[PDB]
Amino acid sequence: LSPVALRQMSCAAGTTQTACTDDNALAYYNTTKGGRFVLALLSDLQDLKWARFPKSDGTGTIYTELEPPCRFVTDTPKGPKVKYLYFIKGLNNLNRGMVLGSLAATVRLQ
Amino acid sequence: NNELSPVALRQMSCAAGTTQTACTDDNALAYYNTTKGGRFVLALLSDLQDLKWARFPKSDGTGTIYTELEPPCRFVTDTPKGPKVKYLYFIKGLNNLNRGMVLGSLAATVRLQ
């Protein structure tokens, strides 16, 4: 399948749908035909279960369930930092790989 | 418990051709993973659309490894010298996770049309 730019945007996630309050995650997403398809979230927090995305037309909000997070380490000026990678529930391996390849290009892994 | 053993894809020039004998000059870029034992090649990128084999000399100098390629995926990247048509060749049999890693790396690092 020919590739499509993966982009990032801040977003609210939380333990519960109601707990999605302020911006605490970075969503990795696709701009497809009728709206953005979020594949994964990146966060400092390890207990997220839900992400929240306003539709761009303003007609509503989408809540996406998260898989258990994948812990990984990034190289920063302040030293190594632990982060959590949350695939969207049910994401297939092709899309998981795309997230991983975009992640390696956009954060200083290991 | 769930910890990510990640990897960035590296790139190396490599030889490819329509036949094994036609692999002579380095006319593609191979995307590969460095593993503790050897380089794992996932895919080739080339201007050429008719490639079927990639060639890599064995690390010792003993012999040669020929890797067969899937049919190419055509895409257009935006470069300073204007748009350039490229062809992405997965290694024959590459699983979907590794296919995604290449597709995700590309789309994250080049501008596409």
CSV table of all heavy atoms in Angstrom, one decimal, chain A residues 54 67 88 105:
chain,number,residue,atom,x,y,z
A,54,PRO,N,-11.4,15.9,19.0
A,54,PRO,CA,-12.6,16.6,18.4
A,54,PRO,C,-12.5,16.4,16.9
A,54,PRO,O,-11.4,16.4,16.3
A,54,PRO,CB,-12.3,18.1,18.8
A,54,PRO,CG,-11.3,18.0,19.8
A,54,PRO,CD,-10.5,16.8,19.6
A,67,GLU,N,-4.6,0.3,23.6
A,67,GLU,CA,-4.0,-1.0,24.1
A,67,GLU,C,-3.1,-0.7,25.3
A,67,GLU,O,-2.7,0.4,25.5
A,67,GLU,CB,-3.1,-1.6,23.0
A,67,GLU,CG,-3.9,-1.8,21.7
A,67,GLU,CD,-3.5,-3.1,21.0
A,67,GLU,OE1,-2.4,-3.5,21.0
A,67,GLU,OE2,-4.5,-3.7,20.5
A,88,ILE,N,-3.6,2.1,19.2
A,88,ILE,CA,-5.1,2.1,19.2
A,88,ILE,C,-5.6,0.7,19.3
A,88,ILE,O,-5.0,-0.1,18.6
A,88,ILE,CB,-5.6,2.8,18.0
A,88,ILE,CG1,-6.3,4.1,18.3
A,88,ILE,CG2,-6.6,1.9,17.2
A,88,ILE,CD1,-5.3,5.1,18.9
A,105,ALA,N,11.8,7.9,13.3
A,105,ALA,CA,12.3,9.1,12.6
A,105,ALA,C,12.0,10.3,13.4
A,105,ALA,O,12.7,11.4,13.1
A,105,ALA,CB,11.5,9.2,11.2
